[PDB]
Ligand binder design. Structure first.
Ligand SMILES: CCCCCCCCCCCCCCCC(=O)O
Ligand SMILES: CCCCCCCCCCCCCCCC(=O)O
Lengths: 131, 131
């Protein structure tokens, strides 16, 4: 995942609040999340990939091996089971919790890193550029 | 309600999608509603006040006597019981349906007409100016 390594800054967001609505995130949390312009930091050490999201009010970090299911506490505090695989040059993440699931794809588009989140038909697209 | 009579055009909206989310409006309907820039038309004939909302995809109209509960079919198709009273120079509407309720206040602010909608703590503010 060499094409993903680096620090990325959010440049645009589309339908993110609707996605969080669908995920079940509370109003207050949605408002904070929407004000935040996080920096995504991706690094690789051996077979362990680390994705870190930093924002003034909440930093999240997940370290994982591609293909191995792991426990993740999301920014909105959901305890989920996540699995991330490398498919077609994109990092495809599936989070499962309480019989529900959502997919988060991180892919390269030109010189940008695009993150697409899908929850029951609702799709959010967030574009990042290198910091 | 002479200060309300006229045709008004939407100039700004705040937290409207969040309000509709709280009300339980579906994703598709929320998207259409958000694209719309309706014209509000208020008129009075005797003791009957008529509030009409016009938009490319949905026109709504309610005629009522201040203080008398009536049936209303909302734009998002809810069948509610509405009561509108004149309090402090503002038109205060309460809609009740399935054990729930929401308040919609229409008031004058300077040369503008402000509509505030409240649903379980979530407040939306839409400002209109004369057309
Ligand atoms: C105290 C609030 C902190 C922020 C809370 C955010 C709540 C929503 C979390 C959604 C996580 C999945 C979306 C990630 C989007 C991205 O990678 O840019
Ligand atoms: C086919 C879709 C048409 C539009 C559907 C709108 C759905 C939400 C209706 C909310 C009604 C109460 C808010 C009124 C706001 C205002 O007076 O400007």
């Amino acid at each position: 995942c060499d094409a993903f390594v680096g620090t990325w800054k959010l440049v645009s967001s589309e339908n993110f609040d609707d996605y969080m609505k669908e995920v079940g995130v509370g109003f207050a949390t949605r408002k904070v999340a929407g004000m935040a312009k996080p920096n995504m930091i991706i690094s690789v050490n051996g077979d362990l990939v680390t994705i870190r999201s930093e924002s003034t009010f909440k930093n999240t970090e997940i370290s994982f091996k591609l293909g191995v299911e792991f426990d993740e506490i999301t920014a909105d505090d959901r305890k989920v089971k996540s699995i991330i695989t490398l498919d077609g040059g994109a990092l495809v993440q599936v989070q499962k919790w309480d019989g529900k699931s959502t997919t988060i794809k991180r892919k390269r588009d030109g010189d940008k890193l695009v993150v697409e989140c899908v929850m029951k038909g609702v799709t959010s697209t967030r574009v990042y550029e290198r910091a």
